[PDB]
Write a protein that binds this ligand. Structure first.
Ligand SMILES: *[C@H](C)[C@H]1/C(=C/c2[nH]c(/C=C3N=C(/C=C4\NC(=O)C(CC)=C4C)C(C)=C\3CCC(=O)O)c(CCC(=O)O)c2C)NC(=O)[C@@H]1C
Ligand SMILES: *[C@H](C)[C@H]1/C(=C/c2[nH]c(/C=C3N=C(/C=C4\NC(=O)C(CC)=C4C)C(C)=C\3CCC(=O)O)c(CCC(=O)O)c2C)NC(=O)[C@@H]1C
Ligand SMILES: *[C@H](C)[C@H]1/C(=C/c2[nH]c(/C=C3N=C(/C=C4\NC(=O)C(CC)=C4C)C(C)=C\3CCC(=O)O)c(CCC(=O)O)c2C)NC(=O)[C@@H]1C
Ligand SMILES: *[C@H](C)[C@H]1/C(=C/c2[nH]c(/C=C3N=C(/C=C4\NC(=O)C(CC)=C4C)C(C)=C\3CCC(=O)O)c(CCC(=O)O)c2C)NC(=O)[C@@H]1C
Ligand SMILES: *[C@H](C)[C@H]1/C(=C/c2[nH]c(/C=C3N=C(/C=C4\NC(=O)C(CC)=C4C)C(C)=C\3CCC(=O)O)c(CCC(=O)O)c2C)NC(=O)[C@@H]1C
Ligand SMILES: *[C@H](C)[C@H]1/C(=C/c2[nH]c(/C=C3N=C(/C=C4\NC(=O)C(CC)=C4C)C(C)=C\3CCC(=O)O)c(CCC(=O)O)c2C)NC(=O)[C@@H]1C
Ligand SMILES: CCC1=C(C)/C(=C/C2=NC(=C\c3[nH]c(/C=C4\NC(=O)[C@H](C)[C@H]4CC)c(C)c3CCC(=O)O)/C(CCC(=O)O)=C2C)NC1=O
Ligand SMILES: CCC1=C(C)/C(=C/C2=NC(=C\c3[nH]c(/C=C4\NC(=O)[C@H](C)[C@H]4CC)c(C)c3CCC(=O)O)/C(CCC(=O)O)=C2C)NC1=O
Ligand SMILES: CCC1=C(C)/C(=C/C2=NC(=C\c3[nH]c(/C=C4\NC(=O)[C@H](C)[C@H]4CC)c(C)c3CCC(=O)O)/C(CCC(=O)O)=C2C)NC1=O
Lengths: 162, 172, 172, 162, 172, 162
């Protein structure tokens, strides 16, 4: 699971090396950023219901057919709507995890690995999730370094879908 | 491998949960003590040649049958292998005190090592006395009050002690 | 792997025997029904995306703990692996109904898979419910009387059913 | 064991592919040929004693020393003659198997793999077996596609020995 | 692998000991008989095609079920494998009589072979009858008094017999 | 363990070959040399205490600080002196083993493999051992082929340290 600290260890272990000054600087940067990251994860968590339901609503607004069209892949049913918001929650939960982590690792391991198969196989449009991530980006109301890092992971998820 | 932060994350994901504000509080605590944690990595690593050599020297003095002909550390190859073993373990310990989590030590070092030593005929208890020796020396070096800003490194020392004991338990 | 024809051949060679005229009669019977056997391969394969997705969707609905956090199909990686598993098995089933013999399904797919799932912690019975679901759908598709010359595909359907049941039994 | 159908499956499996139209055409050809193949195997089987004993006799005629010369490798003994006809039967039995199979698979797996070692190690001349296969080719009295496919396997065995 | 000389050396090193003058006396004895030891290697090797073929021919005559359809030496592949097996073992025996030590035969040939044959379904006792046959023929060839300087090769023959019996015991 | 005979076998086994005349000539050479080798090993063994203690003394003479300086790596203690002579004995014991063996195998397997790590890790100077080997070379009092082969292994050990 990729964080700054695990990446430093992995690579030195590749070379059979003890950690040197190089890697201790990596730890220094992790600690520098960690306040911002942990603040952002807490901000997102405490406003999770609004963002998630807001982002789901934003997808339905942008793609109206997703609430009308026939199919277990659409939000045309009570249950289908439930699934959708759930995926959007998973996304947001992952963004928080990356923030706690200081890296994309949680998202890579838990969400991004095999996503394309899931979306192909269940006929889910990447463009739906892209919109929601864009909505969350617009609406979290974070500022400073927290917003920048949070947006790095939201944007990382859009690159992953694009 | 995990680190302090991804450990709590994996535990949370297993539960479909966000991290609790209390959990974050504990991580911010680890971060605020990050300078000291480096120092520990830096000092052990900086003195790791001393630590492997001194702990091995002592082990052989305490268990002379190891370096006697027929012994498990007899012959340069077997001695080299042993010294390498002490080094590898100390290296993985430093990785754990650096990451703030034990999984790297478990996964890439300790897992299956006991069985490896039984198959090989290596005395796992002996390896463990040597790990215990490296622990005392690493802590004395790490916990030294000279040439450094005075403060409390008590949490980290218990935590470093844990990784050593965990490594010693695995080879047993 | 064997097919219908090499299966009887291997059985004969084990006995230093020529194939009996009766055996040849049964093979000529399989050949005379060959068009229908294609159709089965073609239809299942043509609709295999539907079959994997629908059977999986149903499995998760029936056993919701699988897609709950902590569940075996929770996380994209584990879900992807599962969907891949259903696909691989359905693929091997089509191979068996195409070849007219089960050995390819046994050798390259089913052999050792039970043990693999126990080691992994994958719920083998759950995999089996999903195979059972793919069987019902594949047959309904395969045995459909529309857009095709009417005839009797009863032998082939039992035989297709066999391969599915055999696959379900192996993961158990 | 190589037949048209197993070759099609093996190769798609190489590529991790479902059978497509390409392979279903392979099955179509197998079914087209199978009448001829199964007729040929039955024809050969029912006349097996005459062909086999005829082919053995043809080898002795062509190579007279094989019935005089001293050695367990020669037909200079009651038993040695028994062995020879037995090998010739194995050959014919394999030709039938290939015919049933629609492929050289049975021969490859049961006879051809390691043959050269056997012949070297027991001091058996490839040229003996080549003659018998030629005799069987001349004397089976098959016609049409059956003869052509039967002759493909008899000729395949001569290439294998040559 | 070891040879006569490194065998006594490894035994000595295990004991932190110099080789004793008595041990050296026995090695000088082996050296003084070295010409004869070659002859044994040379003669068996020179006639090894005869030895494998004759021993196999006899084995199949004594145990006809082996070459009957369904039998373990039935089919060219399985026959080729068997002949190869007899050859490999005879080759390793010649290596041992050449080196004056058994370890090469143990390490690269015999170790684990019993288990290999059980897994494979190969009749290990049958392999052993064949090794026993190759032994009688190799010795008759090796111990032949014609075309050679007359002398006593009695030690070497017992020693060659040992390697064969050791190989036969391992496949059992 | 490399001797002439094991090297011959290893390499033929590499190629899956029976021993041929080539390798039997190897055995011939081993037997030719073996008298000299076994005489040399016996000569060294019977004078082992003097050579070893003489060589240790020669190292102390050349490097006086090794008996004064503070450190478990030095002969500045009763025990440290004991260790040193012991290593020098190991060296000589290995030289005898190679002589018995007709090859460097014993030394390679027992002493040379991992030596550099040992010397680095215990802060032992290669140059100490080099001197002792040179002293043993000067003082064994062997002559003829025995001396030449003995000196080959002593010199082989100096190349190993250099
Ligand atoms: C919302 C944006 C749109 C939508 C959602 C919807 N999703 C599903 C089904 C699945 N979604 C996933 C996604 C994940 N699984 C994971 O494990 C993770 C990371 C932890 C993610 C992001 C998966 C695997 C499924 C299928 C398995 C399941 O049912 O849980 C559905 C149902 C699909 C079906 O065909 O049954 C729906 C409706 N649909 C919309 O139209 C919204 C705009
Ligand atoms: C030293 C304190 C003791 C000792 C050690 C010794 N170890 C070996 C051999 C091996 N040790 C390991 C352990 C590891 N390999 C790894 O890759 C890692 C993590 C990266 C570890 C911890 C392995 C795999 C071996 C086998 C490979 C090898 O031999 O080098 C030996 C040699 C055994 C032999 O007979 O060759 C020895 C001697 N020996 C002692 O006596 C001390 C108590
Ligand atoms: C799906 C119905 C269920 C399920 C499946 C699941 N499987 C795995 C992992 C593996 N599955 C296999 C099976 C095969 N590999 C093959 O090569 C073939 C034939 C060509 C088969 C049938 C293997 C080898 C693995 C291991 C490799 C891998 O992980 O991809 C997992 C993942 C387990 C993990 O923890 O990683 C899952 C989740 N899971 C369910 O919950 C369904 C009941
Ligand atoms: C007849 C054309 C000539 C001939 C035959 C002869 N053959 C043998 C011995 C063997 N022949 C084989 C051949 C096969 N074994 C197989 O398993 C298969 C495919 C299924 C084939 C074609 C083998 C393996 C043997 C040796 C093992 C055995 O005895 O069965 C002999 C005896 C050889 C000996 O040296 O003992 C003879 C005489 N000999 C002639 O001169 C004929 C013209
Ligand atoms: C012959 C006297 C008997 C016999 C032999 C037979 N052996 C095999 C298969 C194998 N034999 C071995 C043995 C070795 N492999 C090695 O690399 C070495 C040392 C260098 C040895 C001694 C191995 C590894 C195999 C497996 C690989 C292979 O199949 O070639 C078979 C074939 C079994 C099968 O079903 O394929 C046979 C038939 N068979 C008899 O009936 C005789 C009693
Ligand atoms: C004498 C020339 C100088 C010297 C010697 C000295 N050596 C040691 C310690 C070790 N020496 C070895 C060497 C070997 N071990 C082997 O297994 C073999 C081949 C079979 C050799 C050649 C090793 C492994 C050790 C350390 C392990 C042990 O204690 O046995 C010491 C003690 C080193 C320490 O730091 O404790 C000394 C003093 N020292 C001198 O100054 C001499 C000139
Ligand atoms: C890459 C090379 C490098 C390293 C490793 C490094 C570490 C480092 N350790 C620090 C502090 C510290 N280090 C310690 C450690 C200790 N206090 C004790 O009394 C214990 C004996 C010991 C336990 C390990 C303490 C208490 C502080 C002050 C705490 C702080 O500022 O965080 C600081 C803050 C500045 C300072 O006080 O010097 C840095 C930058 N800086 C570097 O440039
Ligand atoms: C490569 C693309 C391709 C395929 C797959 C194909 C199959 C194929 N299936 C056939 C017949 C058939 N297919 C079926 C199958 C069925 N009858 C039923 O009622 C069942 C529901 C169903 C069971 C699967 C039957 C009964 C026939 C007539 C039998 C025959 O002619 O063999 C025929 C003969 C011509 C025809 O009747 O159409 C062909 C060529 N042809 C192609 O060009
Ligand atoms: C590379 C090709 C090659 C080989 C193999 C070879 C071997 C060889 N064997 C020898 C002797 C010998 N070989 C034997 C062997 C035997 N005596 C018996 O009665 C036993 C039946 C038999 C047991 C194997 C004996 C007794 C001697 C005389 C002993 C001796 O000179 O060492 C000699 C000394 C010269 C001689 O007597 O001919 C050589 C050179 N020379 C070569 O150029």
């Amino acid at each position: 699971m990729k964080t700054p600290l695990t990446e430093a260890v992995a690579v030195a272990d590749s070379q059979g090396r003890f950690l040197s000054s190089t890697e201790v600087q990596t730890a220094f940067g992790r600690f520098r950023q960690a306040g911002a990251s942990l603040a952002a994860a807490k901000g997102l968590t405490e406003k999770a219901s609004s963002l998630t339901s807001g982002a789901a609503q934003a997808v339905y607004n942008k793609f109206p057919y997703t609430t009308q069209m026939q199919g277990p892949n659409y939000a045309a049913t009570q249950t289908g709507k439930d699934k959708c918001v759930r995926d959007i929650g998973y996304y947001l939960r992952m963004v928080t995890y990356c923030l706690v982590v200081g890296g994309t690792g949680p998202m890579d391991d838990y969400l991004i690995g095999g996503l394309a198969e899931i979306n192909k196989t269940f006929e889910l449009s990447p463009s739906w999730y892209i919109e929601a991530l864009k909505y969350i980006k617009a609406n979290h109301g974070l500022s400073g370094d927290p917003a920048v890092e949070a947006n790095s992971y939201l944007d990382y998820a859009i690159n992953a879908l694009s | 491998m995990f680190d302090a932060f991804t450990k709590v994350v994996s535990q949370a994901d297993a539960r479909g949960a966000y991290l609790t504000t209390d959990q974050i509080d504990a991580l911010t605590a680890l971060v605020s003590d990050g300078n000291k944690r480096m120092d520990v990595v830096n000092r052990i690593t900086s003195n790791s040649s001393k630590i492997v050599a001194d702990a091995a020297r002592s082990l052989f003095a305490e268990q002379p049958q190891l370096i006697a002909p027929g012994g498990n550390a007899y012959t340069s190859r077997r001695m080299a292998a042993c010294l390498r073993d002490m080094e590898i373990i100390l290296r993985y310990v430093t990785y754990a005190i650096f990451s703030g989590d034990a999984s790297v030590l478990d996964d890439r070092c300790l897992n299956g090592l006991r069985e490896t030593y039984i198959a090989l005929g290596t005395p796992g208890a002996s390896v463990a006395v040597g790990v215990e020796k490296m622990k005392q020396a690493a802590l004395a070096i790490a916990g030294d009050t000279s040439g450094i800003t005075p403060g409390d490194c008590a949490s980290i020392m218990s935590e470093v002690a844990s990784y050593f004991d965990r490594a010693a338990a695995a080879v047993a």
